[PDB]
Amino acid sequence: MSTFNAETADNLEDIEKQFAVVAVEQAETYWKLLTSVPGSKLRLTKFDDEIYENFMERFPEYKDVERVKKFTEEELKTKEAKERWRKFFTIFEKKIEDYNFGTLLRTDASAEYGQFTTCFVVRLQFYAFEIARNKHGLNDWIVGQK
What family is this? Predict the structure, then answer.
């Protein structure tokens, strides 16, 4: 009920307002953190290890180094994948509260922070690919930047 707390949806542009600002800052924050210290000690969540494991259990297609590094927007935008991200959410709805907090994630791990080399995602999709890339060391090169 709009009279009570939560269920608060002002408009889609309001959703995209809070989303756009948090996403762009979250990206340059991640970048800054790695250029200082290696991504290994950086915990994405207090469930990061088991999020990685459930990602390779429910998606044994992704666990390949080449399927960990990069994705395209279109292969997420298929009905099958959208549903799969909802099933993937229903696993972590018990532990990851802010699954749809809004985050900027790069399409390819070894690609920079450019329009075509990045896509807009939720926190759940971010953590999934990010923890993966971190263990696989596909985002190692940020600690080697200047």
Answer: Belongs to the PBDC1 family.
Between CA 50 and CA 46 the distance in angstroms is: 9
* Experimental technique: NMR
Give the CATH number for residue 73.
1.10.3560.10
Report which of 53, 68, 94, 62 is spatially closest to residue 81, judged by C-alpha positions: 62
3-class SS of residue 25: helix
Q: Name residue 134's amino acid.
A: N
DSSP secondary structure, 27-81, as one string: HHHHHHHHHHS-TTS--SSTTHHHHHHHHHHH-TTT-SHHHHHB--STTTSSHHH
Number of domains composing the chain: 1
